[PDB]
Symmetry: C5
Subunit: 246 residues, 5 copies
Amino acid sequence: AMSEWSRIAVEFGEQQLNLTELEDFARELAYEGLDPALIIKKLKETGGDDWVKDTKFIIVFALTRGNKIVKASGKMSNSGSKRLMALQEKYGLVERAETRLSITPVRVAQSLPTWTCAAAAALKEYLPVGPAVMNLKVENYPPEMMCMAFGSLIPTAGVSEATTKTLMEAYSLWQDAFTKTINVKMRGASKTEVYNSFRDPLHAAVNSVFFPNDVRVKWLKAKGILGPDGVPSRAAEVAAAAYRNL
Amino acid sequence: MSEWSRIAVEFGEQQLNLTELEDFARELAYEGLDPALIIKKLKETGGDDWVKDTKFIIVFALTRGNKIVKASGKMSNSGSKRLMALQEKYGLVERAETRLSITPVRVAQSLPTWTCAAAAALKEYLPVGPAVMNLKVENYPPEMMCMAFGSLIPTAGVSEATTKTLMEAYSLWQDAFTKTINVKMRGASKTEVYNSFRDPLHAAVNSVFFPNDVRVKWLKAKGILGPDGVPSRAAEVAAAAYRNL
Amino acid sequence: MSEWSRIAVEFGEQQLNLTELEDFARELAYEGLDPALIIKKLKETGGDDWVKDTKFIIVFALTRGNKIVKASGKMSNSGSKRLMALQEKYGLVERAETRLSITPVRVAQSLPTWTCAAAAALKEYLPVGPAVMNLKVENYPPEMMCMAFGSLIPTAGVSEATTKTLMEAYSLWQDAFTKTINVKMRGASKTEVYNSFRDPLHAAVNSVFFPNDVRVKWLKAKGILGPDGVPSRAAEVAAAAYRNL
Amino acid sequence: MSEWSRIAVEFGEQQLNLTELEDFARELAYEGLDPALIIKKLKETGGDDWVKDTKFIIVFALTRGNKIVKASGKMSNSGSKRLMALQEKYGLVERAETRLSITPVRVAQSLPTWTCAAAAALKEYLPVGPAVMNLKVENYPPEMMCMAFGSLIPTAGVSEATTKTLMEAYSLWQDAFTKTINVKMRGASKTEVYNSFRDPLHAAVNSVFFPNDVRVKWLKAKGILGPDGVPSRAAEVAAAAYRNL
Amino acid sequence: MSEWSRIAVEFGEQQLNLTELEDFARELAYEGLDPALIIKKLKETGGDDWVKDTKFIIVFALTRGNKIVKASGKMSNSGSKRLMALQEKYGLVERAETRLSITPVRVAQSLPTWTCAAAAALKEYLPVGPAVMNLKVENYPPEMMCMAFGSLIPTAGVSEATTKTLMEAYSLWQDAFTKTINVKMRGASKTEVYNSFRDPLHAAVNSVFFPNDVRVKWLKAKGILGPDGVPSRAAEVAAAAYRNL
């Protein structure tokens, strides 16, 4: 009212919302941890042959050591150090995901989710936070869930909303545990504060559409995490309950 | 007494000038932003694309905040490209250092009634949404879930009791926003957290730019103030929640 | 036994010169500011805009502190322009590093009786005012709601308990100030907080720059002392309140 | 339903090569140091002084750790000179960043039977020695009070319960060391403490450089294992005492 | 077994030279200062201003510590100007980097008996004076309220149990000083801060520079030890106080 600027503010408020375009903007700008297609393309293009061989290796590193290439290269066998650093030069691996284009080894593992989670369980005895830590909270925690990549495999279609919620709570057990075990800064945070530090990445993975739900459900059934009826395992239901109970 | 000592004393014998001083106080009192300068800049720069460009900036502020570069690595390709472009185009910055610093949130703050309505329509997208609020109160007004709602609390055409409830109701989200989003506030009391936002909120409320005669109408239309001029039920329960830690 | 050990042994054998020592201690003691240094600089640099300039600088100190650049980003453009102008005009700084360092607050401290009177006149604009204070005690004396008040407590013309009591009342505000305003010292003990301000508070009180015959007269004329030279009701309560954690 | 999506899927559809994988995991597994790399550098560079030089470094590592420069300003003048000489002479560094980095503590780890032997002799000089271990357990084996003892725990020629006990006894010191010395670990949980050394411990216990037959025969000679091949009273009680938080 | 592996094996089958090792350990153990060095530097550099110069330096150390520049900006002009001159004059540093670092406190520690006397005479000027210790203990010995006291604690000329009482009585001031002055030390257990001073204290007490016979005689001349060579009432009380957390 008072100035032309004041009136402009008021009239801008008088407008009517376009709910279809506001939504688009919202999703356009919504959190996103990675573009799996860009990482797979970068990888396959860069290494022609020897890209499946080279990628897997990057995934075992991510699974067992994280993103910290340089510190890690100094604390490993010579051949593993040698190859790791070779692959870093070769793919331009970075230790921190600054932009959409930055290839961290954990982004690599998150981009091939069903291979990673399978490798996780085969290697459960090498994971930084595996059966030891998990088993003393629940009997038989599904080892495929012991990695950053498992959230991409929780489905949102072909299962009940309750099933999807169970899988997230169960998975949160390991998320919360990994964080505490691994993150120095996070030590002493309430259960909610731990949660928030991973709310967004887990959501973006779940509600992502790159890895198709029908493939998820089948994988889940095949691993026993869902029964044939499409509802969680015993172990999942407990892990979920455990997590709801702190 | 040295010559100086004697000056110091004679300086406190002077009569106070209560208008001089008040004027001084207000001129130096914390000020959140110049919305006028912000709107003028966006319009003069954008031409007519400014109205859409703004809405797009406001949605960014609503769901991502101010950290443009960090957030551009964590979105879609369309979002990121458009956002970087709007930044280059308008001179957008991530920190509100000076009065001329155009931050996404300050843009949101300079078009209040749109932002809140957008926030409510985009409520499921907010970093502190109904997921958070509901654990504290059933039916938290979604128009209160954003940084811009502060400008809409009126101080004229409602009682200072109505005003105060709207601010306590609002302080519930201010609290949860801070505690949820920024690490430097872990294990901090309800009086420390309030203090981290005392200054901006009191300045938002007592801003003269966005007029109170519209604030009351808009609140009414949005059911946060009833027709009798008093808060809704959802507000009163929200105030009560905050009053009780 | 040889021969530096001998020098050491023989060194400790000497008789102390208690005066030598006590003078060394006074020279090396904490000192917060040379008020005369301050006032002299202001009066030489600014001519007579100096009396106006100081008030306005003091109001800045009383309501926003020492943070010249951050504050100026967050205030009316009028206030912002005169602040940066006065900074350059007087070489105002943000941190006291040397005795030469002229900060707003030190300026505030160099004209005590004016500062506390304006603190009183502008209670509602203080970052720690009657709001925070009434949650502690009924009627907390407003003149004590600033950094300047310490300089006004008497070490002569009153009983030593009177002095102890004024300082105990004051530490209510001091403690409140720090906790409310220091980002560090958040989960910190009472004495820990007290230790953050003992040395300056003690230095301020024991200062010889501002005469006690004026302090007592002013304190009585403000009612913080009664005519018999003893604390008021609300001062006695404030001490006990500080005493009682 | 995308080119790249279809790639991810059939990718995750591959059979694992459990041997491919086991090998990658081991290659990428945490490795504390390459003792063979270490010995070979000390012996190529040291010629024959190497033995007596190594002994001196191992002694500094045992009693001051790895912080060469800071420690040299706080010791005797001769020991300080000899420190800095051996540093230039062998490229001794303070942090183990690469596999090539030669730290005193690493040097010590590369010769664990000597190191643990000489640690028991130097028990009164150890940062964490018999005073701390006696407030926890009767008769803590002195050979254990060092970073090198982990390598001496065997996985071959003893029961796998023997091994667990030996790791549990040892963790008592390990836990005490980190709490005593690491300013960060202060006020952390027992688990939080165990994690910071779980990895290097398992790598040491599981290394193949220093042979299990020799580890066992040595521990027999030191009575950390009785003739049967099972723990000592002290190991057993020390084990139990670590277990009980 | 093979092949560098075999070197590490035979390296550990080498007999221990306990003469070699004990020497190494002493050369390498913690040392706080060559006080002879310090006195030597001061006498040669200063001729006879040297005696009065040191006295002044020590008063500085006692009441303000080692931070020359920071403190010189918060004292009288007189004291600031003399302090800086002495720093240029003597090459004074604020931090104890190497054995040649002559810090104020290090000067105080080089002339222990003088310092503790000076400390007791200036007890009210000390950063941790009676105000602190008087709450903890009735009549805490003022000579112990400084860093130099530990060199005075005797190891010979008195019983082992007497010594432990002094080290314990003293630690009460040690504990108090560290907690009350170092912020990084806040929120920390008793053992965490004891460790903070354990090495320096041990190094002082066990030093051979200052002869034990003087220590005892001097302790006696102050009533810290009675004529039979035993701790005072104040001594045993303060020790009890310290063992009782």
